[PDB]
């Protein structure tokens, strides 16, 4: 009774099929992928950030020249220079005039905002998707555990024990190479580590926050101080973190394709909708009822009354049941055409209790299999009129 | 569900439609059209006696 199921991957509306058990009574499932958070692999490449030029304060020497070595600070810029007569609260102090030099002096430096505010980017491979699936199984009637979905993993979480995919929609939403910010994710070309030209992004490139070692390619250009005094002309581009903040491109929680949400958080992208899941339960048996207790419906009819030609369960039948004891009946269409509502039914002795279904057929031609009885519940539906609300519990559009 | 329908003037008697809203119990009219007052445009020119 391993119940093997190819399932459409969708987030939100539970997927009722039926055990087939030869020999004892069928149960109906209620499979809700309340998630599809995916967590592919990656790697923190380099944060990015802006840069801040905390300047050292220069040398002034009165009278003759202060040679400059290249300090091993990120992107050292220093350059001497010469001809100043540096205006410092007494007038000018160096009493030389030409002689006068100045050794101005600049390092890039993470901001105090790189270890909070900064993009971060990634090579991203393809990792492994996740669920909270809930079930509402059978007569357990709850669990809500987190799965994976390569195709031998099971979770016993609550009495079933459930295997999923692996899926066949291998689109990774995430592009090889991933900025992210904050919780806006970018899936741009960054450039790399140790190569972003100035003014571009990564312009300063930290392995991490930690990291004392950069690559800080701003372009940053000393130039002398003016009219003998006292100051540091740092020429620089503004960081390419500035603008990625008013120049960038939109995210991909707003941009991605095949219906994803994102999170700064494990790196997941949730709730992506798209293709199929072979997903396969083995049930306890415990939980099955035998064939010989639960009611023999036979003889019975089915027809619509007012059938909906749409998303929300508009679609209803009600059903001549005929049953030969009383009580519970699950209830499914093995047909993908007619998605119902109501996964059980109650019964007394040969009754008539309506459902509420779902179809997209104009002539719903489905097959009704109340508790090892099958009819079909043909008939014809309405369109509706009122469509501007969140998405279908209906997903089985075909050729009609 | 918009319930559009043709409907003779004439002013002291219903006109007991039907809405034929797919999908949920039907509902019936009662258009009385109790009163047919007009009021056109006009313009007093002049007063006699």
């Known amino acids: 009774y391993e119940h093997t199921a190819v399932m459409p991957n969708k987030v939100g509306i539970p997927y009722k099929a039926l055990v087939e058990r030869p ?27 802006k840069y801040k030029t905390k300047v050292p304060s220069p040398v002034v020497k009165c009278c003759g020249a202060t040679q400059c070595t290249s300090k091993p600070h990120p992107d050292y810029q220093c350059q001497v220079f010469t001809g100043v007569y540096p205006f410092m609260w007494g007038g000018a102090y160096c009493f030389c005039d030409t002689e006068n030099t100045q050794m101005s002096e600049a390092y890039v430096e993470r901001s105090e905002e790189c270890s909070i505010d900064h993009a971060k980017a990634y090579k991203v491979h393809t990792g492994t998707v996740q669920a909270m699936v809930n079930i509402t199984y059978g007569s357990v009637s709850w669990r809500s555990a987190d799965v994976y979905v390569n195709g031998e993993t099971p979770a016993k979480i609550g009495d079933a024990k459930l295997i999923i995919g692996p899926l066949s929609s291998a689109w990774s939403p995430f592009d090889n190479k991933v900025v992210v910010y904050g919780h806006e994710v970018y899936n741009y070309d960054f450039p790399e580590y140790g190569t972003g030209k100035a003014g571009s992004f990564g ?24 009219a003998g005094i006292v100051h540091t002309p740092f020429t620089q581009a503004p960081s390419g973190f500035e603008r990625w903040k008013r120049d960038k491109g939109a995210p991909l929680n707003d941009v991605a394709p095949f219906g994803c949400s994102i999170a700064l958080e494990p790196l997941r992208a949730e709730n992506c909708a798209v293709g199929s899941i072979p997903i396969s339960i083995d049930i306890p048996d415990a939980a099955f009822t035998r064939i010989s207790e639960t009611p023999t419906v036979s003889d019975l009819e089915c027809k619509i009354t007012e059938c909906t030609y749409a998303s929300d369960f508009g679609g209803i039948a009600t059903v001549a049941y005929k049953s030969s004891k009383a009580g519970n009946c699950p209830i499914h269409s093995p047909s993908g055409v007619a998605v119902i509502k109501e996964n059980d039914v109650t019964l007394a002795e040969s009754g008539s209790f309506t459902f509420h279904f779902s179809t997209a057929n104009i002539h719903p031609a489905f097959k009704l299999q109340v508790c090892t009885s099958a009819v079909t519940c043909k008939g014809d539906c309405k369109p509706p009129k009122d469509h501007i609300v969140d998405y279908p519990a209906q997903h089985t559009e075909s050729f009609t």
């Not at 995916?38 to 380099?46: A, D, K």
């Not at 312009?203 to 003016?226: E, F, H, I, V």
């Open 203 to 226: 312009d300063l490139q930290s392995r991490t926050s930690t990291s004392n070692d950069l690559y800080a390619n701003t372009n940053l250009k000393l130039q002398r101080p003016q």
């Open 23 to 49: 020999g004892y009574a069928p149960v109906h499932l209620q499979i809700q992928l309340v998630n599809t958070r995916i967590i592919p692999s990656t790697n923190l490449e380099y944060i990015t950030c």
